[PDB]
Design a binder for these strands. Structure first.
Ligand SMILES: [Mg+2]
Lengths: 217, 136, 120, 163, 99, 45
RNA sequence: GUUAAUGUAGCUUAAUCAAAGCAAGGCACUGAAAAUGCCUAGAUGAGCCUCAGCUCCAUAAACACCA
């Protein structure tokens, strides 16, 4: 029983910006706001607003708004970063900067001599090597890029066997800190993709079960 | 009574006990005494996520030993004024810290755990994993 | 004139009574039994009971406790038993559901706190 | 939780000297010679379905939920009494009879379930009616005359009443 | 050497008088409560799918690790041990506006 | 999953009024801090 | 496509008063848990039949298979 040894890697991009809220979560947010300010004790700003609103009414017959309008204008004048750097492009699946809300994963295109391969990035390890070392090595080597990715465990994520011979595909989880992609226009096709899209582009049953150990968020 | 069959029927104390190293064996590998530092600027948020961690642990059978708050660090931020050249202005902030200690783990459970923790991270929440030795 | 069981009093609750009200609260249903020291349940009202179940809503509610109380009072009078002991837990005494159960039982005409023994 | 678990443990038949043993569970296990009327035959699944439905309908209303949160609700006791008489009543009446030792002094060993409800009452005056429920107390003044008796049967029927 | 911040500051003592009124009609009351029940159901389904998720993940771990043990014993000699790289794990939460 | 613990109120018994604040550290990044001052924004140098 | 089994809510009751007990959730209460209080969602795998029978679907355990 000859055993073909193949390491493999599940590469996780951190979600950058927070998601919008479900209608229910929104109504609940409103409620929590209301009740929070309902049980609240005074305010310094509201002390100086109300006490002076009354005391000026007593100095007329016998501030706060300034600050309000100041902060209004200093907020309104300022402008913020776009929540969508994806849909303004609306095209690139290959951009690492694509989706801010979700976590993203790397795919590659390869056409081998006898085969057509859409590939979650794979490794090949010699018996003397550790699956770990081969994971890292394959990562840094294949993508032609400088990647800081903090790995989690020494234990692998999920495993799928193709037996013609017999063979193994061992998927590992790597958490991407900061990648630097050299030659952003290289021919090798690297696709950065969410959960639904990972469901779409993946033909095999070996790569079909990767969304089983993936974090659906 | 010692002679009788019913002896020691009322025996209890072995049921209730009323009276630190990581174990690394390389195959069954138990790495314990771990510190979770949840640090954030907002009180409510930090407490809430600390809470979520605690409850999550209790559900996963992972043993929590001590859950406690670290001393808040009071920040005084000095912002430059444009009119006066070297003139300073001020704004006050505060850093809040919570701590959850877990007593045991395995490789697989470490991998899983961290996934769940960082997946559920709220905005403005800084997470840390460390070792039991710390000085208050 | 009969004998109650004086005794125990290392343990709890008191076993001294002819009749004892017992209120069990499941995470689903409220069950009120009236017991005799034999352990034998004499007269009871439960929320699992179709008669009570079908008329009202939310089997576990305060409302349900009140209900069961009224039903039980009724059946108690019908059974000829006007007196029983109720021994709640300190925190069950503070609870609303049970305060209103006791109220329902009182207005129903059943007195808690049994009469004393004669020549005890 | 402990209290519960303990009371369940105190109901099991242990192999050591116990309170139940000495203090008279009253014959303990007893095989019951039963002279009954045969239990009414009703479809399990059908009944279940109907009840599920009724509870769906009752839970559906918003009015009901309002009645629940605000602690204002009442149960139409007469109807509950009717349903109880119709359904599990016979068994409760039975165990009351067991408690008061009706079966012990009458048939000596024998338990029957009172399938047909029996409504007895006395006339205390023109407008006054004193009911006889199982186990209730009545004054001999009330009982000076023969009582009114009511139960439901069509007639091919023949019955015997006994006081 | 413990000093807690759980304590209520002195500033908050006599300024209490600012927030006496609270009142709701039948509307706000029933709305809030209904919403709360709704919310509990929601949170429940959420916890459920969460636990089912981590459970499925753990099952992928079972099949995986067991597959690797059935193939090469040396490989669960290697990978069943926990690496020193995990001691100072640090991660920052998402933000509202990207840099 | 980021909205999990995000929805909460401060649970201490006696406390000041807390108002939503947008805080910009030195990134280009913004966060939401509850702060007593009604000011809609603050930024660190 | 073949054999030994099944499909009660997350695990275990009952199926002649009746779908039961426990986990599990929310909010309140104290710093977290916990307890307690007020609350929340729930099932007899799906289609016919006789008043257990016939299939289907799916899981699971194997084998065959497929890559
Ligand atoms: Mg039934």
């Amino acid at each position: 029983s000859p055993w073909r040894l193949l390491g493999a890697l599940c590469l996780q991009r951190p979600p950058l910006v927070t998601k919008p809220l479900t209608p229910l979560q929104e109504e609940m947010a409103d409620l929590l706001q209301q009740i929070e300010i309902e049980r609240s004790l005074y305010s310094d700003h509201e002390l100086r607003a109300l006490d002076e609103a009354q005391q000026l009414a007593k100095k007329k017959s016998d501030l706060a708004q300034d600050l309000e309008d100041m902060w209004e204008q200093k907020f309104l004048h300022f402008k913020l970063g776009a929540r969508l750097t994806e849909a303004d492009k609306k095209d690139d699946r290959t951009s690492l900067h694509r989706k801010l809300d979700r976590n993203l994963i790397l795919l590659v295109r390869e056409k081998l001599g006898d085969q057509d391969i859409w590939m979650l990035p794979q490794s090949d390890w010699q018996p003397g090597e550790t699956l770990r070392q081969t994971a890292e090595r394959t990562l840094a080597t294949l993508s032609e890029n400088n990647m800081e990715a903090k790995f989690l465990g020494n234990a692998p994520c999920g495993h799928y066997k193709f037996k013609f011979l017999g063979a193994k595909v061992f998927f590992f989880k790597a958490l991407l800190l900061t990648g630097d992609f050299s030659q952003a226009g290289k021919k090798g096709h690297h696709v950065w993709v969410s959960k639904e899209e990972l469901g779409d582009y993946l033909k095999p049953k070996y790569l079909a079960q990767v969304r089983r150990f993936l974090l659906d968020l | 009574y010692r002679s009788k069959p019913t002896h020691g029927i009322g025996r209890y104390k072995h049921l209730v006990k009323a009276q630190v190293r990581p174990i690394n064996l390389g195959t069954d590998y138990e790495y314990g005494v771990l510190n979770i530092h949840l640090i954030a600027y907002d009180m409510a948020l930090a407490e809430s996520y600390a809470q979520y961690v605690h409850n999550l642990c209790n559900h996963l059978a992972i043993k929590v030993e001590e859950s406690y708050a670290m001393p808040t660090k009071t920040m005084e931020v000095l912002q430059l004024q444009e009119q006066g050249s070297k003139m300073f202005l001020d704004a006050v902030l505060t850093t809040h810290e919570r701590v959850v200690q877990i007593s045991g783990l395995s490789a697989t459970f470490a991998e899983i755990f961290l996934e769940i923790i960082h997946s559920n991270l709220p905005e403005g929440v800084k997470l840390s994993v460390r070792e039991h030795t710390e000085e208050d | 004139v009969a004998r109650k069981e004086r005794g125990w009093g290392t343990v709890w609750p008191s076993r001294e009574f002819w009749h004892r009200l017992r209120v069990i609260r499941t995470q689903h249903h409220i069950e009120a039994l009236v017991e005799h020291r034999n352990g034998q349940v004499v007269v009871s009202a439960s929320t699992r009971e179709w008669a009570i179940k079908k008329h009202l809503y939310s089997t576990r509610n305060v409302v349900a406790c009140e209900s069961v109380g009224r039903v039980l009072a009724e059946r108690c009078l019908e059974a000829g038993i006007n007196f029983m002991v109720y021994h709640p837990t300190p925190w069950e005494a503070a609870s609303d559901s049970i305060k209103r159960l006791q109220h329902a039982m009182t207005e129903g005409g059943v007195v808690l706190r049994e009469p004393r023994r004669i020549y005890e | 939780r402990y209290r519960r678990r303990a009371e369940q443990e105190a109901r099991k038949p242990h192999w050591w000297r116990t309170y139940r043993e000495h203090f008279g569970e009253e014959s303990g296990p007893k095989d019951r010679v039963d002279i009954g009327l045969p239990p009414p035959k009703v479809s399990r699944t059908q009944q279940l379905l109907e009840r599920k439905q009724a509870l769906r309908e009752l839970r559906a209303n918003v009015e009901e939920e309002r009645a629940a949160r605000l602690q204002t609700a009442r149960i139409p006791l007469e109807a509950v009494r009717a349903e109880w008489e119709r359904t599990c009543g016979p068994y409760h009446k039975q165990r009351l009879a067991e408690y008061c030792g009706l079966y012990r002094d009458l048939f000596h060993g024998a338990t029957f379930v009172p399938r047909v409800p029996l409504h007895v009452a006395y006339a205390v005056g023109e407008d006054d009616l004193m009911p006889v429920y199982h186990g209730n107390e009545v004054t001999p003044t009330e009982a000076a005359q023969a009582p009114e008796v009511t139960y439901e049967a069509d007639e091919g029927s023949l019955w015997t009443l006994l006081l | 050497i413990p000093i807690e911040d759980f304590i209520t500051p002195v500033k908050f003592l006599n300024k209490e008088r600012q927030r006496p009124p609270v009142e709701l009609p039948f509307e706000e009351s029933e709305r809030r409560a209904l919403l709360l029940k709704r919310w509990s159901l929601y949170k429940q389904r959420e916890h459920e799918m969460e636990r089912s998720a981590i459970r499925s993940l753990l099952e992928a771990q079972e099949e995986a690790l067991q597959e690797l043990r059935l193939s090469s014993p040396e490989l669960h000699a290697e990978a069943t041990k926990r690496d020193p790289s995990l001691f100072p794990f640090e991660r920052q939460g998402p933000d509202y506006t990207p840099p | 999953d980021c909205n999990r613990a995000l929805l909460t109120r401060l649970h201490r018994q006696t406390y000041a009024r807390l108002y939503p604040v947008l805080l910009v550290k030195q990134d280009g990044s913004t966060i939401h801090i509850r702060y007593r001052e009604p000011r809609r924004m603050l930024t660190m140098p």
